[PDB]
Every structure is written in C-alpha cells, then in structure tokens.
Design a protein around this ligand. Structure first.
Ligand code: FCO
Ligand code: F3S
Ligand code: F3S
Ligand code: F3S
Ligand code: F3S
Ligand code: F3S
Ligand code: F3S
Ligand code: MG
Ligand code: 3NI
Lengths: 45, 513, 322, 322, 45
C-alpha cells in the first residue's frame, strides 16, 4: 500500500526527527501563514 | 543411435538438437530451444509503446524487423495514419536489415560448415575452404565485412543499428535529409556492386532476377565464368556436388506473413487491409496449394514447450507462463520454443516453414497486384527439385537482388518534403497485429492495449514457426522434419544437423524471446 | 590473446553491433590483432562436443583464457538453478562462474551482461542479472569483489547494444599493449567512452542550450532537442554515441530518437512503465522530473528560462532540413 | 552527366578532400553514378592538345557540359588579364567564362572558387575572386546575375577545403534525380549541409552552454569549448562539420582546433590579422566581439553569466579523457 | 513507534494550536501552491 509506505517513512528515525523539529517550530510556521493571511486580507489597504 | 548435439551454435542463440539416427540417417529429431528471457511476460503492464523498445531486443540480427512489426502492431491497434514516406522508410530499413542478414548469416553462420571435413573428397572442397573458412575465407571476409553496409542505411534513417526504436505509431521518428537519402543510395549501390553483384552473383542483380526456373538457375551458373565462380554459382555447384540438395526438405508447407507495404495502400494500417497492401506478398503454401494468410488462423501450442497450457492459443489470447524445465521434461516438454501452428482448411493446425523459401513460394502465388512480388522462380524450383538445404539457402540468397532493387526504388520514392510522421492518438484500448518478414520469415506481434497499458503482448517469430517443437498431435516442427532424413556421416561432428538448422537461418533468441 | 565469447540471456545484438565494427572490422580484429576467438555462439565453427571441449578446456585451465566476453544476462531462474539458460550441458551461470574465474579479463558486453538490462526488467522471469551489477547495484552474479586474473573487475561495455567500437577499441588496446591506458568508471565502464554524455556531440545541443523542444516525430525532428517532450536521457547518460557515431552514420538523438539512456545501469529506465516511453516526465507540466547530470532543478530551470528568453531565431526553426 | 573540373587559384585541397569521399567513394561516384568526368587536372588522363580538345569542345558546345566544377580562385591579375593563371593556352578566367556559360550547372568547390578565399586575402596579389562572390559580396567573377543553363546560380560548396560529402552528395543528388531536392541558401550553399552550424554536433557544445572555456591546446582541449579563448567560429559558421564528420573521424572542433569559419565567405576572417589567429577578440577582456549567430551581446552575456553560475561540475572537468 | 512519537506530539496543546491555525489558512496555502502551479504551467507563456 502507498499510504502504508508513508507510515513506514514516518517510522524512520531521521524522517521522524525532522518531522518532530517541524512540529517544534509549527508555531512559527502558523504565525508566518497567519501573517501572510493578514497581509492578504489587508492587501487592499 | 540417440545423438544429443549441444550446443548447435551459429543459430543466434541456444539450441540443442536431439536426433535418432538409424543407418546413418536421422529418423526423428527434437529441437530444444534452451534459453528463455520472457519478453512477453515483461511487456505486460508496460507502456503501450514499450514493445518498440523491448521487441528489437528479442534479437540483434532481426531487431529491426521486430521494431517494424511492433510499430505496425501499434499502428493497427491505434488506427494510426502512416505517411507514405514513413512506410517507405520502414520498408527500406526492414529490407536493409534483411540485406545485412543475408551475407552475414550466409558467410558467418552457414557457409563455414561447407568447409567440413565430410566434404574433403569433393573436387570443390579446396575452393570451398579457400572461400568460406571462418575468418580467413576469401569470400567470408568481404561478405561479413560488407554485411554491415545495409544497416548503415538503417542507421542513417534510424540513428543506429542494432537497437533503434525509431519506427513509431504514425510513422518514423526521423526526418531524412537529402544527404541522408543520397548517402543511403550510395551505400546501397556500393554494397550491391561490391558484395551482391561482384562477389555473390558475379553478374548484375537484373541478370540474376531473369532466372525464372531451376533450369534458368543452372544455365545461369554455366553461362560464364563470372557467374560460375561467383559465390552463388560456386554455392550451387557445391550443393549439387556434396548433396545439400538431397536433404533438409522439411514440411514442404510454408507461411509468409509478407512485409513491405505499398505506401499508398497502407496509409491507415488495419489488420484486414494488411495483405492487399503488401509488396512482399503474404501467403500460405500448404499441400501444394496457395492460401491467403490470416492471422486468425495462428495458434501456439505449448504441449512440448516449457510453458503451462492445455490448448493451442491464438496469440491475442496467448499466454507465456513458463514451467520449470525439469518438470516440463518430466511431462515430455523439451523446448522453450512454442509450437506455432496454422489452421489450413482440410489440413488442420499444421506446422508451416517460414523464411525466404516461404516468401518465394508466396511470391509465386497467382493474382499478384502490380505493387506485389510476382516471382515464379521458386514455384518452379519447388516443383523441379523440391525443398532442401540448397533450395532454402537459394531462396534466402535470391532475396538479395530482389530486396536490393526494392530498396533502391523506395529510396527513389522518398518525397523528402513530405511528412514522415502523423502524430497518432494513443488510445487507452486497442488490439494490434503487426507482421513483417524478418530475414528468417514471418514475424508477428499480437498486442492488446488496455487501460493505456500492455494487456497482452504475444510475439511469434519465424524461427518459432520453424524450430518450435512437436504440437499436441506430435507433428514435428518444420526444422524437426527437415532434420529427419538428414544423413549423418560423422556423429562426432554431425554437420548435416547444422546444415539443416542453419539453412533455416535459425535464430534461437527470436525463437524463445 | 584467446577470447571466449559466451551468450547468456542475450539477443545477440552486441555480437551484431560488434560485427558492424570498422577500424578495425571484426575480421581484422579476430585475425590481424592477435585475438584468438576460441568460440562464439554466433561465429564459432565447433558444435556439440567439440565446442564443449573448447569450453571445458577454458574452464578447467587446460588452455589459457585471456578474455572472457559475456553477452546477455546471467540467467538464474528457475529457483536459482539457471535452467532457463542451459548451454552446452550446464546452466549458463555455471559456465559463467567457471570461465570468469578462469579468464585474465572478463568483459560484459551490453547492459544485459553488465547490469541485467531488459531481461532484468520486472518481473524478471529469467532471474536475469549482470555479471557484476544488478542495475546500478554492484555485485550482480559474480559479486562486488570479483576480480579477473589480471586484477580487473568485469569490464562493463554497456549499451543495448554496445557500439562496436566500445568493445573493439578496448580489444585493440589490450592487443596493442595499451591495457594500462584503460581506465574504468564506477560502473566499470571504459572512461575513454563513458566520460562523455550521449548529449556530447548531439546535433541538438544548441536547441537544448536554448531550451527549444522538438515537438513531434518525423519532420518535427528537423529542429529542437528531444529532452523536453520525448524523454531524451542524453544529458543524463554517459556514452560517446554522438562522439563516435553509430554505424559510422548517426545516433539515436541525431536521427530524432530520444536517447533511452541505455548505457546507464537502470536501463530500461522506469522499466518502461506507462507514460515513460518517448515522454519527458514533468512536475507541474513544465519542470522535468530529471534534470541533466550535475544540475539541480532550481538552477536548471532558472537557466532554462534565461535561455528561452535569449534564444536566437534559428534555434526556433528547422535546421536538419532536406 | 559530363563533369569538367577545372582548377584556378587552387591548392587542390578540394580535389584531395573529394578524393577522400566515402559513400560514395570517388571512383564509384565517377564510374557507377553516371557522372562522366571529362577531365580534372589532378585525375584526367589527357594532356596538352588532347586535353585542350576536350576543353574547347566543352566551351564551344561541341559536346555537352552538364557540371562545370571550378576549384580555386578566378585569378584576374595582372591588370585584369588573368595571366597569373594561364591554363591550356588561355587565362584561366577565360576558360571560366566559356565553361560557366556552357555548363548546365556550375559548382564552385571550396572558398577560393566560391568567394575568393585565402588567395583573395589582402593584398590579393593574384587578383583572385570567386565565381559569383568576392567574399560576402555577391557577383564575384561571373556577376550576380549569372545563371547556368539549368537556371541555377553557381552552387557554392564552400569550405577550405570542402568536405567530400558536400560535393559528392550534391553530385549523387543530381545523378539520382534529386536535383530538385537541392535548396541553396543566400550564399548559394546547399542548405542540406549549411543550415546547421559547425557547432551543431560539436562535442564541446555542453561546455559552450555552460561557458566553460578550453584554456590551452593539447591536453587542455580534453575539456571546454574553444569559443572563448581560441576564437572558435563554430557558432557563427554554417557547416555540417560536426554533423558529417571529416574523414569519417572528427572535426576541427572535436579535435581541439577552433573552427576558422571556413565555410563562411569572409574566410579567412579578419584576414588573419595579428592577434586574430586562434584567439577570441574580446571587448574589455570579457565580452567576445562576435557572439553566436542570431544572438545579441546583452542577452548572450546575461545568459553566459547565468550559465556560468549554474554550471555543473562535470562541465568544469576533462571529458575527452584517455 | 516514531509515528506514535508524533501522534503524542499531536497531543501537545501548543503544537495542536499551530497545526489548527495552519489548517485554518490551508485555503491560502492551497491557493498559493495552485498559483505557483499555474505560473509554472504558464512559464513558457
Ligand atoms: N529474422 C528473424 Fe528473427 C527470427 N526468427 C525474427 O523475427
Ligand atoms: S543488445 Fe541484446 S544482448 Fe542484451 S544488452 Fe541489449 S538486449
Ligand atoms: S541535445 Fe541531444 S542528447 Fe537528447 S537532450 Fe537534446 S536530443
Ligand atoms: S539509448 Fe544508448 S546507444 Fe547511445 S543514444 Fe542513448 S546511450
Ligand atoms: S582547400 Fe585549397 S583550393 Fe582554395 S578553398 Fe581552400 S585554398
Ligand atoms: S561548442 Fe564547438 S563549434 Fe566551437 S564554439 Fe565551442 S568548440
Ligand atoms: S574551419 Fe571549416 S571545415 Fe568546418 S570546422 Fe570550421 S567550417
Ligand atoms: Mg511468443
Ligand atoms: Ni533473430
């Protein structure tokens, strides 16, 4: 199954480490996308 | 005496021949194709055009033929349009590959056996050795060396030979330039002058093609010293002296699927319109009678082949499911060759010999259209002396002048400003039949495209026709029956088995694919 | 220098290509360069027991074996028995074992022998593998650590088939005392032929430089490079196909056929899966999935946009005109 | 088809190149293609009055003259008398007048005949000119409006010398009924050979694309393109030198020699003035004075900078390795 | 299991909050990637 192969990659130490580090800074990603959303909804202004 | 000859080389692949010998004569024969690659298995599920890449790899010497028929299988499956230039280029390249095969096979694969010690008593033996000894023969070296020229023409149009895939549904990939055509003509004329006419014939191609009867051929041999001492004249005299005209008769029934479409008649390739469009006519010659070739009559039997199966299958429903040769031999199977049979009315599913002789017999059929090969020579030879190693070889060699003339004319026919390719619709579904006459005979692809993938891909090669084992009725394949009756002077070097198998120009990589 | 040329899961295309040799031609190579061709299934005179005598003498060391050329795959099916390739009374793989162990030099000619090639395409019914590679993975049939008696690994002359010069010039080099001039790349290919790319000398590189695509086959190939629409692997394929022309005439790419990357161990690439034959796989319809060797998608695409902007008019027109 | 091949201010290089013809070779062209070579100074059997009889019969129309090939320049010095080229009792230019007026087709082979070539280099002591061109300027000796009896202008097969195929394939085309397939460019060169550039098929175009320069001759030419440091005119020169290889082997550029643009009417370019031989003239030491055909210095240089920055590593290493 | 390592990291209030804010503006991310895809497929134009 392809989906099961992505779950297999998610069981790889290095992939897991990177995904964990992404989740650690997910707040920064969230804030940058929120900032972009804000900038977009104020693009007329 | 049960004699197992392994390997029987110079058959482009892995062949073993088992023969029962009684009183110095083969009384039964088994051809054992010993090497399996399973390209039909591999092609399943691949891109619909994967055949254009894979099928040439069935065989080095006749891959261009594979390409030709695979391309036409796609053309029919996808109902493509073939611009006349594309048809011409395909014809030219198919014929050029055959023109390469003719001398390359004759000198490198066949004629060196003419130096066998069994012929040491022949008055022509010293000359045979001088001419045809491997690698040093005075006919061997120029024949083999010049055999590369026609496939230079092939490479001009296809990029390379072997292993181009430039024949595609809707035409050819290439766009010949003026210098391409002029160089192809120059190469062909040089090869014709230097090997075909100077060495093989000792006369012009036109003079050879004037031979319409066997008596014409004998008169041609004796006509002058040039023809007498030509490789062709010497070969005929050697065959008559050493008895190559006396065995290797075979089935006496022939299959030609034909090739070389008249460009105006096959612009929209279909299975049904194929026969009428052929220049090198199709035709089945069975029980002394001419029949129209119909691919629907083609079955493949695996009773004595290393494949699972219980009934002959038309290749559209063909299957290639190998069985382990140990188990298969326990079941009486002895060859990786399938047993192609043809349903001839009043005869059932019979073996048919394929090859140049089959083509010449087909060319002797009545009611040839203007574009079609109409040649009574081998009807006359068949009626006069019948098939044999010599007659089979002479058919092969006879194609040299004929195909050279056709290629020269096709090169003249190229309209360089016109299209070489009509982009086809790559249909998700389709059933294609592509056939050609490779150097060794009827080569055919039955392809079934489903869901934009190869659903089925069945290749039936000419040597599979010739060398394929006994069918369910235990009827020997053409090469097996040709071996039967062959004298065996020396069981330690049973060169006559080689003469018979190689007179078919057997290609075992093609046989099995 | 004795040469034994065996064919396993072969189509004999390497032999036929080899027979197209010029300078030297095959006859002059076999006779005049001191290369004693002991046997070749397509050319050897001996059959049956005489041929087997030659083979057994080579295998057991009764007579020297300087060069063992192997063409075709090492067929191991069924079940590792190799009986889908029975040759001269043995599975061909057993002959390969013995003769590769006996030869001074082992040359795999053609992808089948080098890497497994087309027969090794899935599902690989014949259990085909190369002599020292299975596709890119080193080891093949003989193992990664196999060395011939001259210390060399299997010399991989890839291609499907190999060009005659790729083998004949190596044989001439061996015969003329220039074996030491032969350097092999990481795939054991002669670097004298396989440092270049197929693209090297391609008549369409200027179109490639300016990102002008051939759009269609036939007359459409009078212009353009085949990389963008026809999956040309030229820039990702090491070969001298456009340096040393095929049949002394042409090359696939010159003729308008995409390079299928046949000198590369992955050949046939993508196993000819649907949509990969004579097509460039693209991301978002415009970025090729595979960019030329040594480039990255970012730089390649930036340079491609710049080149498209800078492209001269002639690069947009037919050039291989009648 | 009768052919009369005359040499004016020639070095016979076009004849020698022609004699290198393969497919067809020269003998097969002369014999087997129906081209009756009436005379050739390097090959004709007749001397003296017998040769002059042949020439006069061609000039006066006593016998048909289908193709008049002229090699070498039309020498007009001294003072327009042409006596620096006396042939068979006349100034060669007078023979040219008569025979060009008699021929069905006139073919100038080699730059000398096409455009004046090397002898027309200043100070042009021989008063050399081409048949229908003096360098790029149309008209040469015969005038811009000269047409042979088949209506064609002088067919210019340039080069110094012309490659044998450039003439032999034209002769084959004429002999095989494909004269109508022959299209001529603005310099009257066969477009089947002169739509491509020398660069087309050059083994160094990838280096050109990535602006990787050959830095030195000899082993330095194992890498790089010769455009930047050696004045390669490949990208400004129409020729099939890298498509149809010289001597079926190579080309200047492949071998490491810059294309001197010899198929171009200005050849030798810059009259071989000091500093222009095997050197790229540059502005401010970085910008080539001449950019490839159809490009502009600003887009070329911008693309060149982009290509340099995105250059792969292999483009910066030897590729034509031993 | 590393996939359960990140399933437990998906039980983090702050990581969950950020991932929820990303899914809130996933439409903007989708449209920017669609815009990039569009720009890429019109890169020749
Ligand atoms: N010729 C040939 Fe090969 C065989 N048999 C095919 O088709
Ligand atoms: S030419 Fe044939 S032997 Fe293998 S390398 Fe290609 S399938
Ligand atoms: S330059 Fe040639 S090698 Fe292929 S990628 Fe373009 S056709
Ligand atoms: S497919 Fe192979 S023969 Fe050359 S052109 Fe490509 S490396
Ligand atoms: S080869 Fe010689 S004849 Fe003139 S064109 Fe060059 S100097
Ligand atoms: S690509 Fe070749 S033609 Fe000259 S400009 Fe560079 S060496
Ligand atoms: S100098 Fe002339 S011969 Fe060709 S490589 Fe340049 S056009
Ligand atoms: Mg089959
Ligand atoms: Ni074959």
């Amino acid at each position: 199954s392809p989906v099961d192969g992505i779950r297999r990659r998610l069981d790889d130490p290095q992939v897991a480490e990177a995904l964990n580090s992404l989740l650690d800074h997910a707040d920064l990603l969230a804030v940058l996308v929120k900032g972009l959303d804000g900038f977009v909804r104020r693009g007329d202004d | 005496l049960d004699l197992f000859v392994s390997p029987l080389g110079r058959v482009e692949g892995d062949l073993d021949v088992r023969v029962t010998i009684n009183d110095g004569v083969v009384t039964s024969a088994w051809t054992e194709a010993a090497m399996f690659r399973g390209f039909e298995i591999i092609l399943r599920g691949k891109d619909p055009q994967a055949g254009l890449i894979v099928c040439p790899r069935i065989c080095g010497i006749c891959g261009g033929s594979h390409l030709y028929k695979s391309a036409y299988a796609l053309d029919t499956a996808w109902r493509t349009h073939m611009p006349p230039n594309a048809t011409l280029i395909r014809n030219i390249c198919q014929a050029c590959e055959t023109l390469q095969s003719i001398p390359r096979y004759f000198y490198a694969l066949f004629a060196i056996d003419l130096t066998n010690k069994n012929y040491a008593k022949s008055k022509l033996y010293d000359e045979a050795v001088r001419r045809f000894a491997p690698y040093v023969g005075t006919s061997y070296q120029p024949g083999v060396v010049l055999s590369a020229k026609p496939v230079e023409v092939y490479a001009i149009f296809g990029g390379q030979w072997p292993x181009s895939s430039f024949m595609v549904p809707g035409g050819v990939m290439s766009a010949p330039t003026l210098s391409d055509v002029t160089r192809a003509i120059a190469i062909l004329e040089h090869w014709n002058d230097n090997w075909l006419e100077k060495q093989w014939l000792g006369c012009s191609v036109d003079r050879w093609l004037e031979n319409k009867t066997w008596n014409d051929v004998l008169a041609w041999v004796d006509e002058n010293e040039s023809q007498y001492n030509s490789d062709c004249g010497f070969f005929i005299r050697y065959c008559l002296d050493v008895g190559l005209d006396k065995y290797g008769q075979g089935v006496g029934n022939y299959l030609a699927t034909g090739t070389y479409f008249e460009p105006s008649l096959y612009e929209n390739p279909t299975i049904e319109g194929r026969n009428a469009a052929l220049i090198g006519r199709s035709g089945v010659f069975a029980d002394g009678r001419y029949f129209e070739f119909d691919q629907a009559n083609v079955t493949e039997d695996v009773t004595h082949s290393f494949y699972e199966g219980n009934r002959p299958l038309h290749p559209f429903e063909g299957e290639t499911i190998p069985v382990n040769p140990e188990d298969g031999r326990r079941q009486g199977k002895y060859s990786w060759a399938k047993s192609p049979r043809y349903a001839v009315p009043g005869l059932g599913n019979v073996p048919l010999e394929t090859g140049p002789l089959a083509r010449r017999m087909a060319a002797s059929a009545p009611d040839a259209e203007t574009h079609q090969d109409d040649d009574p020579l081998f009807a006359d030879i068949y009626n006069a002396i019948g098939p044999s190693v010599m007659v089979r070889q002479l058919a092969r060699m006879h194609e040299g002048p004929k195909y050279y003339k056709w290629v020269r004319q096709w090169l003249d026919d190229l309209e360089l400003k016109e299209s070489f390719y009509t982009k086809p619709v790559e249909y998700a579904e389709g059933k294609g039949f592509g056939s050609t006459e490779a150097a060794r005979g009827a080569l055919s692809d039955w392809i079934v495209i489903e869901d934009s993938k190869i659903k089925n891909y069945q290749v039936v090669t000419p040597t599979a026709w010739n060398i394929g084992p006994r069918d369910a009725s235990e009827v020997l394949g053409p090469i097996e029956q040709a071996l039967v009756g062959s004298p065996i002077v020396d069981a330690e070097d049973p060169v006559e088995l080689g003469h018979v198998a190689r007179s078919f120009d057997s290609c075992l990589v093609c046989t099995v694919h | 220098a004795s040469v034994l040329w065996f064919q396993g899961g072969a189509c004999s295309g390497n032999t036929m290509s080899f027979l197209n040799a010029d300078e030297p031609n095959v006859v002059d190579l076999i006779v005049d360069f001191g290369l004693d061709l002991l046997w070749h299934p397509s050319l050897g005179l001996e059959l049956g027991n005489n041929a087997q005598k030659v083979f057994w003498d080579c295998a057991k060391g009764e007579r020297p074996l300087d060069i063992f050329v192997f063409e075709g795959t090492v067929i191991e099916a069924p079940n590792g028995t190799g009986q889908m390739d029975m040759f001269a009374g043995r599975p061909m793989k057993d002959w390969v074992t013995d003769l590769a162990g006996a030869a001074q030099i082992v040359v795999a000619i053609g992808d089948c022998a080098c890497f497994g090639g087309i027969p090794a395409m899935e599902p690989n019914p014949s259990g085909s593998t190369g002599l020292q590679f299975h596709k890119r993975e080193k080891g093949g049939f003989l193992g990664p650590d196999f060395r011939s008696k001259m210390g060399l690994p299997v010399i991989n002359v890839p291609g499907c088939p190999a060009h005659p010069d790729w083998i004949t010039q190596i044989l001439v080099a061996l015969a003329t005392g220039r074996a030491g001039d032969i350097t092999l790349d990481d795939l054991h290919r002669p670097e004298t032929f396989f440092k270049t790319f197929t693209q090297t000398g391609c008549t369409r590189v200027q179109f490639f430089e300016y990102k002008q695509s051939t759009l269609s086959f036939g007359e459409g190939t009078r212009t353009g490079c085949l990389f963008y629409e026809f999956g040309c692997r030229g820039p990702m394929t090491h070969s001298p196909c456009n340096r040393i022309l095929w049949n002394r005439q042409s090359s696939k790419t010159r003729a308008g056929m995409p390079c299928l990357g046949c000198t590369e161990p992955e050949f046939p690439h993508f196993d000819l899966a649907p949509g990969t034959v004579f097509k460039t796989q693209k991301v978002s319809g415009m970025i090729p999935k595979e960019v030329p060797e040594g480039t990255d998608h970012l730089t390649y695409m930036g340079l491609a946009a710049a080149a498209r902007i800078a492209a001269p008019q002639w690069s947009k027109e037919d050039m291989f005109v009648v």
